[model samples]
Target chain A: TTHFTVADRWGNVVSYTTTIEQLFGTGIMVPDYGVILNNELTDFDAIPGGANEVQPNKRPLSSMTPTILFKDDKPVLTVGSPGGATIISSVLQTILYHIEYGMELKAAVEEPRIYTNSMSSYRYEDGVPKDVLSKLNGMGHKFGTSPVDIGNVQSISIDHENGTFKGVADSSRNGAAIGINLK
Target chain B: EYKQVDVGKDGMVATAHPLASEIGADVLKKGGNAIDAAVAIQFALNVTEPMMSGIGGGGFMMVYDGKTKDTTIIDSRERAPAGATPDMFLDENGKAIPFSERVTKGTAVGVPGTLKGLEEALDKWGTRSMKQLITPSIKLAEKGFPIDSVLAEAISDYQEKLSRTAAKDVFLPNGEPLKEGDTLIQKDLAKTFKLIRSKGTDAFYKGKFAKTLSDTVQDFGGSMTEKDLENYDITIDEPIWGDYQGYQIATTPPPSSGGIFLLQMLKILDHFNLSQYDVRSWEKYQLLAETMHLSYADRASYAGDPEFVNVPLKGLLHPDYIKERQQLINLDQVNKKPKAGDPWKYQEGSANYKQVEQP
Candidate 1:
């Protein structure tokens, strides 16, 4: 039997049994919005007296990617952004932004990038410098805006020379990136 | 075209390419040190294979000065545009565009980095002039080189794009891709190389080449402004170091996440005695799957540009956190739903560091 279970931080357990390949409903797709509706509400265990209780508009917990950066044996950056496949791409680019470009922590997080997960087609921002976009498009790659929240990247790097730690929170998400220096 | 050689006490040298190896050997034959050999080879590579390592792409070099026995990593990486925005790629619907699009055009291009990076390396570490090191590439560009299979393939693949852009005439002749064994000549590129060789990096940044490159990109719908090209700078930063077994591991930081994730995977797997189980056993697969899932979960939650976000690396890699997470893993049942664990409390001796935040 296929079963789903969720455990709370305090160790409370909620469980449910369901068949595989079950269709909850017709999925929603908004072309203009560039997003597909997620019918995650169906996953809630709403049975009376059940461990999992369904509440109206209670935000469902999502899988989030948290990335960290370090310098001189200390944690220098931290960030948690929301997205699915683009999460990997976001993390990869953020790291490149700093390591490859030597961008300040803020500019690295703020710079625009592209995303492509072999499963889905490629997606790009319209504002990407036009020449580069045209070249890629000329290569016959289809394009669209990424559906997930632009992978929010948060990071930190320590300037050992100055003995100061720098951090960056992605403005894309509701998270904050900051820097701290230990006295 | 770039080559590297490491000579041991036995006097045997290991080189990354033949031409580079020969150049290094010649330098050694002429009573030059390994460092001198390295400088000569870099020049040769810049000339022979301009596309891979040019005055454009930036890279870091780590060297151990034999005399001082001190190791330093020279940074030659690119810089972001002054007008770059964190949300530059976000659409009205709020999504990131793909990378393929951003990489090829002016928007995707950062400042031409290789020239600045090489200049820094020469100034700090070399006993030679920029012109002396650049002469080899100038000769090769002027003489022209045979188009090898790899170069031919690259040209073919990018033919459509090149044909439709300003570079159309540069790579294509008679509206057809150049075939292998063809003598691929780049007179304009050669002239640019000569200018840089004689006048230094300033020539490329302020002269005809920079103007032409920037203008072409702009006319073709690129976002690279003249100011962006003129103001480009490269930074030298510290490398991220880790330990695996008896060897020390180091990697580029931030904009490259592969190093950290690789280290995290290693650390988590270190706790488990994989040798206890048979190779490719169910237990082994389960352990690998669980570790990957957990690590990726953390990566998705926190990784991004360090300048803008605080990433809790210690909290995620703490042993106590791993143990707590392990406790939740059932040997027989797969836990499809994973959650974040508090590593700060679980891992003893794992001191928590404060997040770096920038205003």
Candidate 2:
């Protein structure tokens, strides 16, 4: 699962989120295309009655959240993440941090995060402060034995007043943020 | 820990890898619009981070056109073949198949849409042609770059599986999977991309490439037909809209539960004055968790392919519904187990497609 965000000087922004479902999806490379096939079918629920049950010609539910934030009809931010189900929360929190809470772009992307399906135990990153974890535990949030990290959110924000583009690649993964025409 | 923030006066590109980000930045420097830069970056990632994302898979793209100030979500989300079924993953004994088994087989492959989706984006909003955008990726794949630790580890972990497929020739050379620092050149992928660049997407979807894809999957006990590949298409629609504190939110819609659930979560959170609590306070975390819980609960119940299910999309984001669900949260307490709320009453119409009765 990889994500990227792009913003042109003209103000156009693209928050692109792409994934192959799992690591080395299907482990089957198309000999002709040299492309590995995706195991996206596993995203569907095996049981019936759920909203994501498999059906012919039906798209499986995806958590990819390629998002763009707008102000006064111009795009100010482009953000997204790659963490399967945790992607929803990752994107939400980043937006909340940058847009609602007034945090800078880098802090929003670097902030320790937590994820929950509301059914299973919640997963969190290592840096989520010991005090906060204990408090969350007392608040009924059960910590689960899961991956140490939550999400890798690549985000870009524009200072509309000055047209300065700020791009922050999530530190959790091997990522980069590049600015064009810096001179 | 020092944070690196890349700032500029003109353009910016952020990607999971520096290589792709640089490629995208170059595109932007050349006066390509965001859509063009995105298309270039996506192909570049295919070469640099093949295990994570590529044309072999699909995803959603949210594009905000600066000129029109319109947000459109290009849904290149992969879809099940016509032969797909609810019990496809079941064993003969009526038991569920192991996730590992399913993931390694062709039965788990869906018709891909990434290439077509990106092409449509260019056709609609891009300033560059597919040929120009894919050239850099072709060169990158052919020339190869050193494998990163992430790709190296994945190759080592999935060696047994990759050893069984054509990937063995590329990823596992001379019986050993490529390690970090190994030059991971993909000549075949370069050729594949070259064909698409010259002959257009038809080379991948409706021509020999599609046949190879269908045949390869069938050889692996999958249900994908050549027709499935040929018929695969991309959808362009308005992004799901949500507003928070005067900022308009635009994100992917169904088939992707992100946008709907995201907005649903936001609406619920909007009911409270989050500023009252410290940014890192337990109170804020509690509300965030509860909101995530409520929306994810609703997702399992009412969200799906709108064509297949009567997704209560409108109802799920209705102010009344948000308030109704918001009332379930207690400021200091956690609803340890939250259930899906009823959003059907707020819905106005039926499913986009007729529901077929399951036997």
Worst 10-residue stretch by lDDT in candidate 1 chain A? A17-26
**Compared with the true structure, what per-residue lDDT tens digits does model 1 show for residues B5-78?**
11122122222223434454454454444344445555554444332344444444434343453334444434
* Ten contiguous residues with the weakest lDDT in model 1 chain B: B2-11
Model number with the top lDDT: 2
Q: Clashing pairs in model 2? A: none
Alpha-carbon error at A180 in model 2, in Å? 1.5
B-chain TM-scores per prediction = 0.76, 0.92
Model 1 lDDT tens row, A1-183: 011111111111111111101110111111111111122222222221111112222211112223333344433333333243344445544554554445665666666655543212455433455554444444443445333235544343433344443334354432222111112
Give the winner by DockQ: 2
Fnat by candidate, in order:
0.00, 0.80
C-alpha lDDT of all candidate models, in order: 0.43, 0.84
Give lDDT tens digits, candidate 2, residues B78-149.
989999888897788756788888898888899999999889999999899999999999999999998777
